[PDB]
Amino acid sequence: SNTEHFLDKYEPKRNADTVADKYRTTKQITEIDKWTRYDSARADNYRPLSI
Amino acid sequence: NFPAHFIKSAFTTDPLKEKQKARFSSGGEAMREVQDTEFQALVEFIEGASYDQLISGRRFKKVYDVLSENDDMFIWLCHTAMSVLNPGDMRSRLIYNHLRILAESVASGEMTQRTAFRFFESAVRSPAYREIAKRQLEGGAATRLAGISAAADVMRRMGLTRRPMSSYFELYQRIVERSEAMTPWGFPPLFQFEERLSLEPRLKFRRIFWIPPTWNRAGRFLGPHVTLYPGMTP
């Protein structure tokens, strides 16, 4: 949230280990996607003109 | 009688056909037209829980083998035999060094576990070791706990474990088993270990079918997925 909340006062102190722990789930897009044989042989989603 | 199918790949190819096959299909054409073992086994096994895979016993057996392939059982046997010794007696020092060398050789793989067990049983059936263990048990206060804890620590330090800190969990298991009074401390069952090692070279401690039935083979069968008496899913 972009608005300060009164409970945020009692949050745990920002320690370097915990700061590095909030980026663990940050995954790169090349890791997100994977190109397979189905992708290589995928059919056209539109109507082709010639093969 | 029986037609020749020739399932061998070397009995169905001839130079005359290969001459025309090579021009159309070759390495260049194919290139043009085409584009931590424990942890790896564990992730391979658990990836079967995906939406497009199933849990298979093959992967679990593989990861179990990868986890149990070590000789930490024999190393812990040797070091538990060493724990009962007296750090002051010269005979006990000789036995301790002999058993430490045996354990190191087992860990390094220089000596096969069968001959290592021969050495271990010959060392632990000697009268000197038996007398030392008897004195150790007779003493009102003994050094067995310190000996086994130091054995775990040296197993970590000397790299005699698959992972650095597995020895301490193994020590915890050893203590909780000692709470059961299975055998006196320092008197392992040699007959039991011999029976184990005679068979196993390394000491350790709606049906799914790969071939679906065919219509000719099975008369009245539908399949492993069909439900004859289904319910109403919310």
Binding site: - | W215, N216, R220, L222
Partner: protein, 55 residues
């Protein structure tokens, strides 16, 4: 339009395209499951004849 022996042979072989169901049921068809042979008979009659105006 073949005998039981011929039909069984063609089913055990790969000569007819049929879909095996339970040997002691009514099958996939809702008309069969909701009355049986006579009900499917009546439905066939209704489709063939008893839907036209017949001027």
């Amino acid at each position: 339009n073949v005998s039981y022996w011929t039909m069984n042979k063609m089913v055990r072989g790969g000569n007819l395209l049929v879909h095996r169901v339970h040997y002691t049921g009514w099958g996939t068809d809702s008309h069969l499951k909701k009355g049986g042979w006579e009900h499917r008979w009546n439905k066939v009659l209704q489709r063939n004849v008893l839907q036209y105006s017949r001027i």
